[PDB]
């Protein structure tokens, strides 16, 4: 099956439900973690602990189809190069939510 359906289930996003949307980043972990010291921007929710990558990154967007329902979740796969925006927290100060891509 398509990348979204397969990886959604493999990663335990869709073994127990169907998630409307999820994004996967094809960069090294350390290059994603590096975003938490890049450009500070507001989060969608207005908190201020979000960070936008300087560079675009390889990303796959997965979004449920209109008819998709558990257990037979169904996704549309869209691949793109886009900047990512992550929320960071902690010591070490690392990504804890994927806010958006642009």
């Amino acid at each position: 099956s398509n990348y979204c359906n397969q990886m959604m289930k493999s990663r335990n996003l869709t073994k127990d439900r169907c998630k409307p949307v999820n994004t996967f980043v094809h960069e090294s972990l350390a290059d994603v973690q590096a975003v938490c010291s890049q450009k500070n921007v507001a989060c969608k929710n207005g908190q201020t602990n979000c960070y936008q990558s300087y560079s675009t990154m390889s990303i796959t967007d997965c979004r449920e189809t209109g008819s998709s329902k558990y257990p037979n979740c169904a996704y549309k796969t869209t691949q793109a190069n886009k900047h990512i925006i992550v929320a960071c927290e902690g010591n070490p100060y690392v990504p804890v939510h994927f806010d958006a891509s642009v």
Binding site: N12, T23, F24, V25, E89, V94, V96, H97
Partner: peptide, 15 residues
């Protein structure tokens, strides 16, 4: 308990 950092990785990283 899975931490928030590990959650993000499992959901969003595919290097």
């Amino acid at each position: 308990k899975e931490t928030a950092a590990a959650x993000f990785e499992r959901x969003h990283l595919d290097s």
